[PDB]
């Protein structure tokens, strides 16, 4: 390849191929001249080394270097390795009809919608646009249409809004760790340069919006569009293939909103009134005549499908709030009422979605997830649920607890001076009393936060779980924990050295007071331990997942039943204390191997070849069986495959 100038760019193969012909034709000359034996011997050795460097350079003693003192790349070095032909040009590759950009939120989309910049859709779908500027006669040839798009006339829009109508595009995020990292959304053309990305798919993608980028690919052919719609469409993926757990889980603002809404305060704007339905609850909240946390008696009609798939209504008069009745306007028909008649944290609404999915199917759940999203966003914005400094409330007893523990470490120091305790005993006692003090400060601050708000109940006075902001967004599981809320208002704890040994004087402050110059140096030990860790950890999990994909890489379900009477003996796992995993989880969705005998022994409880399901596990629990022979994949008798029965439930469908 000609570099910039008259010169010629170096190619290592040509260097090796010239080094070979030199210690060649020269040797041919020497064998023509019949030169002495030793000089021709050395020339033959140089030919041997030239060939050994040409084929596999470096497998010898010392790799020869052409320039810059860097071993030049032989033939066997463009075939192997991460930069070889196999892993670089022949297992993954650069791709046309594709682009990338920065993702922003777009909380108005629906699960099947992304928002493409109006300038990136006109570049991906360019030939699709030519094939309509040429079919409508708005142009005549490919040059007319090419310029027609180049100058972006006002007609290469909606032509573009039509080549885009029901044509999905794939949206890939950089480390595609699992398969949910490629999902196909329908595009919505937006003004801008950021790829707006529905909030409920961020969990699957593992994508915050702090600056990470996505890659759109365009499925050209027709089977690729029906695959992107019937297999990859972000709607078809509301369960995880790794476990039967949901993956469309509302998080961190949809749940602070649904929590602030569905919660009670023991007094409010209207706390007695008896409403006449959810619509009147909304009409009252919106008018400012009732508080979203009031305690009203609503009259709700809930549907239940106890019939053979038929919904029968029941109208009752429930004790709820105004918010839990405003929210019952989005819950589909079929779900009970005691699904919103609580204070919904993150788990409560993830379980509400997970029960909608199993009672009403997939389409009501895909419609319910967007409703939950919009109505959690609305009522989280409508609440102003901010965070200030007076919200991290330090306990009144933190000074006393810390002074007590300080006096106790001084007492143990006095015990050590007299020699009644050795070094290790002293250290362990000091660690123990400081850990007990940390626990006491944690409990003090948590009691002070949680039960704090005391409010006059229209009688004398009364306690109630608090409306503290940081406590709300910790208790609702929105974003927070107890460890963190404790490093903010309680004490920060016992920090460990880089090797692992605990420092025997704990950080006794928090980020609402200040850390010392030394308390903040002590913290950086374990702050950089757990960053060097996550930087040295990705390059090591990626290699494991690559070796795992390459070991299996071909286990396609090539039969429907292998007819085996083998299997494993699924039993609830127990290590000595609590049951680590019940039988229902370890046996669900799998095909039994032998008929499980009820402890009414000699009567078959379950047949021999039944995929179980939720209810069959319930029935195994009633008769309280504790060992089921189940058909596993490691006992299948098919060849070059696995029968669909020795696998079981799909776990995603």
């Amino acid at each position: 390849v000609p570099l910039d100038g008259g010169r010629f760019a170096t190619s290592d193969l040509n260097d090796l191929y010239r080094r070979v012909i030199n210690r060649n034709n020269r040797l041919k000359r020497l064998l023509d001249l019949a030169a002495p034996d030793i000089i021709v011997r050395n020339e033959k050795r140089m030919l041997q080394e030239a060939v050994d460097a040409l084929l596999d350079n470096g497998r010898r003693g010392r790799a020869i270097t052409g320039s810059n003192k860097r071993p030049l790349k032989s033939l066997a070095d463009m075939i192997k390795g991460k930069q070889g032909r196999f892993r670089q040009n022949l297992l993954g590759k650069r791709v046309d009809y594709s682009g990338r950009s920065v993702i922003t939120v777009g909380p108005y989309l629906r699960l099947h919608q992304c928002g493409l910049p109006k300038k990136m859709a006109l570049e991906l779908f360019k030939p699709f646009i030519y094939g309509k500027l040429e079919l409508r006669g708005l142009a005549t040839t490919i040059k007319a249409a090419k310029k027609m798009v180049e100058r972006e006339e006002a007609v290469v829009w909606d032509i573009l809004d039509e080549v885009i109508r029901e044509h999905p595009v794939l949206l890939n995020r950089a480390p595609t760790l699992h398969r949910l990292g490629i999902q196909a959304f329908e595009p919505v053309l937006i003004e801008g340069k950021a790829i707006q990305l529905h909030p409920l798919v961020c969990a699957a993608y593992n994508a915050d919006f702090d600056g990470d980028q996505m890659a759109v690919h365009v499925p050209l052919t027709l089977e690729a569009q029906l695959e992107a719609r019937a297999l990859m469409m972000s709607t078809n993926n509301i369960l995880s293939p790794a476990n039967g757990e949901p993956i469309i889980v509302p998080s961190q603002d949809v749940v602070l909103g649904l929590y602030y809404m569905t919660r009670d305060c023991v007094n409010a704007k209207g706390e007695g009134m008896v409403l006449t339905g959810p619509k009147e609850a909304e009409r009252l909240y919106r008018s400012g005549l009732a508080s979203l946390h009031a305690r009203v008696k609503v009259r709700i009609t809930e549907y239940e499908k106890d019939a053979n798939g038929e919904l029968v209504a029941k109208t009752s008069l429930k004790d709820t709030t105004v918010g839990r009745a405003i929210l019952w306007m989005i819950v589909p028909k079929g779900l009970p009422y005691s699904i919103v008649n609580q204070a919904l944290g993150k788990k409560a609404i993830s379980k509400m979605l997970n029960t909608c999915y199993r009672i009403l199917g997939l389409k009501p759940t895909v419609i319910f997830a967007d409703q939950i999203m919009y109505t959690g966003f609305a009522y989280a914005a409508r609440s102003g649920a901010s965070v200030g400094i007076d919200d991290m409330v330090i306990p009144e007893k933190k000074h006393e607890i810390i002074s007590e523990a300080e006096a106790e470490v001084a007492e143990i120091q006095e015990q050590f001076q007299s020699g009644l305790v050795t070094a290790g005993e002293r250290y362990n006692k000091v660690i123990d009393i400081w850990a007990a003090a940390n626990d006491r400060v944690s409990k003090a601050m948590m009691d002070n936060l949680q039960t704090e708000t005391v409010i006059n109940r229209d009688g004398q006075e009364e306690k109630q779980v608090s409306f503290n902001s940081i406590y709300m967004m910790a208790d609702s599981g929105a974003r927070g924990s107890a460890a963190q809320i404790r490093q903010l208002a309680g004490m920060r704890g016992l920090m460990a050295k880089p090797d692992g040994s605990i420092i025997e004087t704990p950080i006794t402050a928090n980020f609402r007071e200040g850390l010392n110059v030394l308390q903040y140096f002590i913290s950086t030990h374990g702050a950089r331990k757990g960053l060097a860790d996550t930087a040295l950890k990705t390059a090591n999990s990626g290699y494991l997942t690559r070796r795992l994909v390459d070991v299996a890489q071909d286990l396609v379900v090539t039969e429907d039943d292998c007819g085996t009477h083998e299997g494993i003996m699924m039993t609830p796992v127990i290590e000595g204390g609590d049951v680590k995993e019940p039988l229902r989880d370890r046996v669900l969705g799998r095909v039994t191997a032998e008929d499980v005998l009820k402890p009414g022994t000699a009567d078959i409880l379950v047949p021999r070849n039944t995929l179980l399901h939720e209810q069959w596990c319930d029935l195994l629990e009633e008769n309280s069986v504790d060992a089921v022979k189940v058909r596993s994949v490691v006992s299948c008798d098919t060849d070059f495959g696995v029968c669909a029965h020795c696998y079981g439930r799909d776990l995603a469908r």
Binding site: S101, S386, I470
Partner: protein
């Protein structure tokens, strides 16, 4: 008392404790090092003198000829810095060394010389360093990052654990020289001591002890202490010293002089030893068969025949005792090898040693070092003598010798740079001492073992490498001497020196392209300690223990400013107060604490001189003379924090900032951030791009006026004076005569750097911050740089944040920016970019730049002038023609796709013999004019001074002032006056005036000649044309914004003004951040900074009210004083009574945007004071107001946190990241789409996305992703045709990159093929 750019806007300081030591010059590790390398030192250490003196005088093979170094000197550069950046050449200074060649006569080894001769030979052109620690290598600005490596010396490590799989710890003594070979010593699981040279392969250490000319007797003399047995009348009693009996069991009945002391088998208690010392009995009876386990020390020959009875190092038995007794060997010397304390390591090693004498060992070493070669006497002798014993191939430097002599507890630190026998034997002795149980190994990450090797070194090293190449070439060329004609330049070749220096400065691992997109970035690039680089460790093979933050990092290296990902803790950043010892180790300041008083004298303690002392923490309350308020105070004794008594301490940290770097110390309220979020804050704050209109931080740290002054962007006064003329592009200071030199008094001129391009394609642009007729004093800013405000760093803007969820537009980390933030053009940045067009002489004739372009409309050639190049000022867009270039068959230079701009500077270069084009000299005629505009200003001021001297002469001795100014300024000399020395001075003034005109003419001609030179280009090209478009990037949904507390986000919307939340005065919020961002990632600093910003802006709004409805200066003065005093025990203490009733009005006029508040890092404001300051405004002390919804008009049913956060605009712009591609160009060898955004390239459907398509089952999407829109060339155009034919169907083939694989396998000797 305050400076002159201080009673202009004075930042309120909340710091509580005085600063006994002020922040040093920030970037001083670069300038000191280079000023040491380049300097003139007569003592020959260190520097260039050291290099020469270490290589010269160089002599031939005793050929009675010698080339000796006399001196050196550094010529003036042929340019200045700016001309070097403009042309594209290094800013270097030629090196002229005055050499000398002396040749002695035949039979004259000390006699007179035949001929002496000397000259100055040019060797190498060494790059110089700018005033800011940067180098200009090829027109760009580079920084040579300091390096952190292992200081030469001896290091005893252990390799605990992971060898031998038995949990037995080995031990190893590695001797690292500054230049030479390594000499590891290590132990074996069988406790045999093996040497290992250059890491090659073990061989018993006694091989090297023998190579040092030692016999086994002498070795056992060296390493073992002897036990003495004596042949006597009977039973052969043994000489015993009671100490050796410590800790074993009785082998026999221990008695002394017939009385029993210790019984068989009993453990000899220390009581027995001490009582035996009481008896003082040395000769002890011994059973003759007990000696059967001992080893003889010295060889024993017979006395009659002289035959060797038993040589050194062989066990004993009754038969050997008989052979010795019959001969009469009254003395027996055996080795005391405790099994516990004095292990028998050298004995066993001698038993494994195959060699016997010196020559055998030398041959064994030669056979290990140079394998496959038949050894010899001279070959092995010379090799081992050149390994560690020749100053030409080994060097423990001064530092290696110091650490060596220190680790062995020797006394003197000076010494010889090469090893010696005693050095090696003592290394082995200390190793065996460690093995025994006394002594301890040292860590490898302790900052007492790691040096810092900055630019004044490594450049001396590379220059010395070039110098040894030169001296080798000369030594050769000096033996073939054609004497009497060789000047000392026919032999000196400046290709080695220049090549080595250029290869170090231009292309190395520590020579990085400067990071220049705000002052902080470059000023914290220059203070960067890289552990990587040539001679250090590597990202991939670096453990977890190199990354961690050792406890000796306190005060020497930042703990919270280091990149993320691959190299965390390999790229540490120097701390604020940290210096480099004369040896290279990091030392930090510490106030000495006398009897109980915290003195004010500071000592710079390194890392080893700090585990000895107990150092009081940085914030420990003193009382008016330095007595700690309490009796037990926190301190750190030996890398271990703990409490101590008040009297035990003997040092105390200087400042509370000295633990953090200078980037981590710009974070207000750092002590409230979790160190992860503070690390992210430091970095992202380093990435912020300079906005259109700088804006101070309301919540600062006080370290902004240092960072923005010590980084150099700003034009700072050199000598005080009065401003005489201020233009947008030059300042003129008339110097105070108290600071003028005797002769040529004059003024000094500062040419500001107007819109010019930085390395990152941004605008670096100085503008004056002074005004006409206004005093300045030394060292205070005259012009502001990029992203500073009144000489005070300002990376972003202060915008009014509301922490609340807003309809999910700030969902994860996003940010909801108002539309007023983009109406006010406050995050608009400027970005210039040079496009190039080179005219090379191809075949079929060269290529010229004419405008004659075939097959183009006239709209294209409309913007080009007649010469072919674009018009300076033409608003171009994507696709337009910028330069017209013609290919003899058309390769004109065109605007890349989608990049707008306005052409601000066209710039043409030409080699010589190519005449010119009208455009090419009408460019650079402007440089002629603008240099005349300076020279003429100097000439006018100087001739004015001269004619003023003339008139001042003509006012004494017959004054004529009325008719002097009538006649022109020419003949004012010979009016009515005497002929004394005053008239002599008049004649001197006439001749000086003529000399002035002549010298101004000659210097202007010098400028025009340096301007009109020929600037040789790269060979193969005729003329280059660079066109500089200038862009303005406005904030828009997609690009990052950040705070200084690691709270970044991506703008998800620009909301209308009427949709933002507003408060009870209708004032809309500027940005809306999410609350849920704060609790989880515990960066509470952003919330306290929000509240303090609200307090500061409340103060500013009170001043704006008091100053809008004009109020007397008395009320302003009293309110601003109330704001500046504010409560607690602080050290600020401003007094406005000494302000001049006009310098308080300007103060208030600068405080109307908001009083700026400081908060030193771990010494900040407290909520008592923040709330007091909110009350001093009129804002709610809770920091939370009641916001209204902008679009439904009703309350957010909660008070929300509203305040002023200082937001930054990181330069991860979105219109720099958005890319799309349908079809473009494809690669050459593997016909796949090209990569990246410049080449219109496609995204990489990686190897991991294939598994995500295989998982779904999507077998058609995958096939079209790797066949049709990718390698397969024949079925890749059929798809284009099908697509633009109404068909969507692929006729797929075989990827042309599988055929490349088949051909590259079939081009090995491997027949791979396809079957049927």
């Amino acid at each position: 008392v305050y400076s002159y750019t201080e009673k202009k806007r004075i930042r309120k300081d909340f710091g509580k404790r005085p600063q006994v030591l002020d922040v040093p010059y920030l970037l001083s590790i670069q300038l000191d090092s280079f000023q040491k390398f380049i300097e003139q030192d007569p003592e020959g250490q260190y520097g260039l003198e050291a290099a020469f003196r270490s290589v010269f005088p160089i002599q031939s093979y005793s050929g009675n000829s010698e080339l000796q170094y006399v001196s050196y000197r550094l010529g003036e550069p042929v340019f200045d810095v700016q001309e070097c950046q403009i042309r594209g050449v290094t800013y270097s200074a030629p090196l002229r060394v005055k050499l000398r060649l002396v040749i002695y006569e035949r039979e004259a080894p000390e006699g007179t010389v035949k001929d002496i001769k000397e000259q100055e030979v040019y060797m190498g052109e060494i790059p110089l360093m700018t005033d800011n620690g940067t180098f200009v290598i090829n027109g760009t600005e580079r920084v040579i990052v300091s390096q952190l490596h292992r200081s030469p010396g001896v290091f005893f490590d252990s390799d605990k654990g992971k060898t031998h799989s038995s949990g037995k710890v080995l031990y190893n003594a590695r001797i690292i020289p500054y230049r030479g070979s390594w000499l590891d010593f290590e132990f074996d699981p069988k406790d045999n001591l093996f040497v290992r040279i250059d890491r090659r392969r073990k061989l018993p250490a006694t091989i090297i002890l023998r190579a040092l000319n030692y016999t086994t007797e002498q070795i056992l003399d060296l390493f073992f202490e002897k036990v003495i047995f004596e042949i006597r009348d009977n039973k052969l009693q043994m000489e015993l010293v009671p100490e050796r009996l410590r800790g074993e069991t009785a082998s026999f009945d221990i008695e002394a002089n017939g009385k029993v002391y210790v019984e068989k088998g009993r453990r000899i208690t220390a009581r027995h030893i001490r009582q035996l010392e009481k008896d003082d009995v040395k000769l002890i009876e011994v059973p003759v068969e007990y000696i059967a386990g001992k080893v003889v020390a010295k060889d024993y020959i017979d006395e009659s025949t002289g035959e060797l009875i038993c040589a050194a190092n062989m066990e004993l038995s009754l038969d050997l005792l008989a052979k010795l007794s019959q001969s009469g060997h009254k003395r027996i010397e055996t080795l005391f090898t405790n099994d516990l304390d004095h292990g028998p390591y050298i004995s066993e090693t001698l038993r494994v040693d195959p060699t016997n004498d010196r020559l055998s060992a030398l041959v064994e070493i030669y056979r290990m070092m140079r394998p496959g070669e038949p050894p010899t006497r001279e070959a092995a002798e010379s090799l081992f003598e050149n390994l560690f014993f020749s100053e030409d191939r080994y060097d423990l430097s001064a530092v290696g010798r110091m650490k060596f002599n220190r680790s062995l507890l020797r006394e003197e630190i000076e010494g010889s740079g090469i090893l010696s026998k005693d050095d090696i034997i003592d290394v082995m002795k200390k190793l065996i001492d460690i093995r025994n149980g006394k002594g301890e190994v040292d860590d490898i990450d302790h900052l007492g073992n790691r040096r810092i090797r900055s630019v004044g070194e490594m450049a001396e090293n590379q220059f010395r490498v070039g110098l040894v190449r030169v001296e080798r070439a000369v030594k050769e060329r000096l033996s073939l001497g054609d004497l009497d004609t060789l000047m000392p330049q026919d032999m000196i070749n400046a290709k080695p020196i220049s090549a080595a220096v250029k290869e170090f400065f231009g292309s190395s691992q520590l020579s990085q392209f400067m990071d220049q997109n705000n002052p902080l970035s470059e000023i914290t690039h220059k203070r960067r300690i890289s552990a990587l680089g040539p001679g250090g460790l590597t990202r991939e093979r670096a453990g977890f223990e190199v990354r961690d933050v050792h406890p000796t990092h306190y005060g020497r290296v930042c703990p919270i400013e280091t990149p993320e990902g691959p190299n965390i803790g390999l790229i540490n950043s120097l701390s604020v107060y940290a210096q480099t010892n004369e040896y290279g180790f990091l030392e930090t300041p510490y106030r000495k604490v006398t009897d109980g008083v915290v003195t004010d004298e500071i000592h710079y303690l390194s890392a080893i001189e700090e585990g000895n002392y107990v150092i009081a923490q940085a914030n420990s309350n003193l009382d008016e003379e330095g007595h700690f308020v309490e009796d037990l105070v926190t301190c750190r004794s030996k890398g271990e924090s703990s409490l101590f008594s008040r009297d035990q301490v003997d040092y105390m940290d200087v400042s509370t900032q000295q633990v953090v770097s200078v980037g981590a110390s710009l974070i207000p309220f750092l002590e409230h951030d979790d160190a992860n979020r503070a690390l992210m804050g430091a970095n992202m704050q380093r990435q912020a791009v300079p906005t259109l209109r700088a804006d101070k931080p309301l919540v600062g740290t006080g370290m902004e006026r240092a960072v923005a002054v010590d980084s150099g962007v700003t034009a700072v006064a050199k000598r005080g004076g009065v401003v005489q003329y201020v233009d947008a592009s030059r300042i003129v200071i008339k110097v105070n005569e108290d600071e003028m030199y005797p002769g040529e008094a004059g003024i000094d001129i500062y040419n500001l750097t107007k819109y010019t391009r930085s390395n990152q394609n941004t605008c670096i642009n100085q503008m004056p911050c002074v005004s006409l007729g206004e005093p300045v004093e030394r060292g205070d800013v005259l012009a502001d740089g990029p992203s500073t405000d009144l000489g005070e760093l300002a990376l972003g803007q202060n915008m009014r944040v509301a922490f609340m969820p807003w309809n999910g537009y700030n969902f994860e980390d996003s940010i909801l920016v108002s539309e007023r933030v983009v109406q006010e053009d406050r995050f608009t940045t400027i970005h210039i970019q040079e496009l190039a067009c080179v005219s090379r002489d191809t075949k079929l004739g060269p290529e010229e730049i004419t405008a004659d372009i075939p097959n183009v409309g006239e709209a294209a050639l409309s913007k080009l002038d007649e010469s072919g190049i674009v018009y300076i000022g033409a608003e171009v867009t994507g696709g337009d023609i910028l330069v017209g270039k013609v290919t003899p068959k058309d390769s004109s230079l065109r605007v890349p796709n989608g990049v707008s701009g306005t052409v601000i500077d066209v710039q043409v270069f030409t080699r010589d013999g190519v005449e010119k084009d009208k455009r090419a000299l009408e460019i650079e005629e402007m440089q002629l004019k603008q240099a005349k505009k300076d020279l003429s200003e100097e000439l006018q001021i100087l001739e004015a001074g001269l004619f003023s001297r003339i008139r001042a002469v003509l006012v004494a001795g017959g004054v004529e002032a009325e008719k002097l100014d009538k006649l022109p300024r020419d003949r004012w000399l010979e009016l009515g006056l005497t002929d004394e020395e005053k008239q002599n001075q008049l004649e001197q003034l006439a001749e000086q005036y003529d000399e002035l005109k002549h010298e101004f003419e000659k210097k202007l001609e010098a400028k025009r000649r340096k301007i009109t030179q020929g600037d040789d280009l790269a060979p193969g090209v005729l003329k280059i044309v660079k066109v500089y478009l200038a862009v303005k990037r406005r904030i828009q949904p997609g690009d990052k914004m950040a705070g200084r507390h690691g709270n970044k986000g991506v703008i998800s919307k620009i909301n209308p003004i009427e949709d933002m939340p507003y408060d009870e005065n209708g004032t809309p919020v500027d940005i809306v951040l999410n609350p849920l961002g704060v609790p989880s990632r515990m960066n509470i600093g952003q919330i306290l900074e929000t509240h303090l910003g609200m307090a500061a802006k409340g103060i500013g709004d009170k001043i704006n009210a008091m100053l809008k409805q004009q109020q007397e200066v008395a009320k302003l003065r009293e309110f601003i004083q109330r704001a500046y005093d504010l409560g607690a025990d602080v050290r600020q203490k401003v007094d406005l009574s000494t302000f001049s009733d006009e310098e308080v009005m300007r103060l208030a006029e600068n405080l109307r945007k908001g009083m700026p508040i400081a908060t030193p890092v771990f010494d900040g404001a407290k909520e008592a004071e923040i709330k007091e300051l909110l009350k001093l405004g009129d804002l709610p002390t809770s920091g939370q107001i009641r916001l209204y919804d902008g679009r439904t008009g009703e309350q957010f049913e909660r008070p929300v946190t509203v305040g002023y956060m200082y937001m930054l605009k990181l330069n991860h712009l979105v219109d720099d990241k958005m890319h799309a591609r349908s079809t473009g160009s494809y690669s050459l060898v593997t016909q796949q789409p090209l990569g990246g955004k410049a080449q219109f390239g496609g995204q990489r459907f990686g190897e991991m996305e294939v598994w995500a398509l295989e998982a779904y089952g999507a077998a058609y999407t995958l096939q079209e992703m790797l066949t049709v829109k990718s390698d397969d060339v024949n079925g890749r155009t059929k798809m284009y045709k099908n697509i633009v034919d109404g068909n969507h169907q692929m006729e797929p083939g075989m990827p042309e990159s599988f055929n490349v694989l088949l051909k590259e396998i079939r081009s090995l000797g491997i027949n791979i093929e396809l079957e049927d």
